[PDB]
């Protein structure tokens, strides 16, 4: 299990997560929930996420990313999860 740093934890809480400690797969689940709540994916190209001007974009250091490429997400998790 992992404990997210605060900005990432606030994203998880916005999407319904409770508490401070999670499995990696729970973190990934709640990131997906957040993207759906905030409607960040392109309805017409649903693997593309446009996160510019969202806290998620700040954490990723990205304006957009493809869900098909896990690399920017993994990089962010390495920096934002404490084990």
């Amino acid at each position: 299990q992992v404990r997210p740093k605060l900005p990432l934890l606030k994203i998880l809480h916005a999407a319904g997560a409770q508490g401070e400690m999670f499995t990696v797969k729970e973190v990934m689940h709640y990131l997906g929930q957040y993207i759906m709540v905030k409607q960040l994916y392109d309805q017409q190209e649903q693997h593309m996420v446009y996160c510019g001007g969202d806290l998620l974009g700040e954490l990723l250091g990205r304006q957009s990313f493809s869900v098909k490429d896990p690399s920017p997400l993994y990089d962010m998790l390495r920096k934002n999860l404490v084990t």
Binding site: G32, I35, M36, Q46, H47, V67, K68
Partner: peptide, 8 residues
């Protein structure tokens, strides 16, 4: 979206 997200 979900089909793709679950594949990460």
């Amino acid at each position: 979206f979900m089909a793709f997200w679950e594949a990460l």
